[PDB]
Amino acid sequence: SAEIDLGKGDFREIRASEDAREAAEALAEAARAMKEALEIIREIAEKLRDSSRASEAAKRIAKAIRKAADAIAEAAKIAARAAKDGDAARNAENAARKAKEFAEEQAKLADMYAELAKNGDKSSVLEQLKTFADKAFHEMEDRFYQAALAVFEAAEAAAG
Amino acid sequence: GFNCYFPLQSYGFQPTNGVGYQPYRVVVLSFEAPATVCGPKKSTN
Amino acid sequence: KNIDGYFKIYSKHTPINLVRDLPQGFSALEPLVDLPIGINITRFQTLL
Ligand SMILES: *[C@@H]1O[C@H](CO)[C@@H](O)[C@H](O)[C@H]1NC(C)=O
């Protein structure tokens, strides 16, 4: 019952055992990190305008993907110990692997695309930026959502 | 990858996906020699 | 014949008691269908 604009607009303040609440602030290292990631990459999806900005913007994005990579794993973890249930906890540890790695794989790659935006040869590299960022932005929200309800699914498993 | 991309892209359709992400069904009918397709003209008593 | 994109077709079937002469008869051919197919027709070949 808390104003958080997730996918399809579902809004919550998880009502379960306090570790699931702790899987709501530690997951707010992700739940607040996802909905911020899909807003600044949303600023880079087409408001990408400057090669000079492309250098450090992708870096902050890459550090945010890197931030997101080890945030989504950090959200999917603590519930699985307080999870009375096992079946609904499988996805989170998978997402703790899958969502982290998929974010991780681009988190480094965004850096190798931030370095290519570092020097900033706007003749072609911006077309690199525009193609993976949306690809990532499509991938990150896809990866977000898959965890974004699998991370609460473990918190749901961690209810009692 | 890495400056090389498939011309494809997968919609990820899961039971939980956002309502704006869930699959939607769309019909687009085109209007446009003899003209044969005609609306039903209702008769009368 | 094809007019106004309508290829009309008229037919008529009458028995034959003659050998090889287009009979000195008289019959009106009548419509069968009015095909609304927009096709140029300049050539035509039969099928047996
Ligand atoms: C006949 O051929 C002409 C070629 O100029 C074409 O424009 C026209 O559509 C054709 N008509 C039909 C009924 O196929």
Report the b/e string of C11-42 with b at 16+ CB within 10 A: eeeeeeeeeeeeeeeeeeeeeeeeeeeeeeee
Neighbours of B33 (CB within 10 A): 10
* C2-3/C6-11 β-pairing: antiparallel
Atom of ligand 1 nearest to the CA of C2: 13
Residue of chain B whose alpha carbon sits nearest to that of C40: B33
In terms of phi and psi (left: phi > 0; alpha: psi -120 to 50; beta: otherwise), the region of A129 is: alpha
Smallest Cα–Cα separation from A138: which of A106, A95, A96, A91? Answer: A106
Looking at CA atoms only, how far is residue C26 from chain B in angstroms? 33
Dihedral sign (CA C31, C37, C40, C46): negative
Which residues of B, range 2-41, sit inside 8 Å of A by Cβ?
Answer: 2-3, 5, 9, 12, 14, 16-21
Number of H helices, E strands in chain B: 0, 0
Helix, strand, coil shares of chain C, percent, nearest 5, are 0, 30, 70
Q: How far is the CA of C45 from the centre of ligand 1 (A)?
A: 20
Resolution, expressed in angstroms to one decimal: 4.1
Residues 6+ apart with CB under 8 A from A65: A37, A103, A106, A107, A110, A136, A140
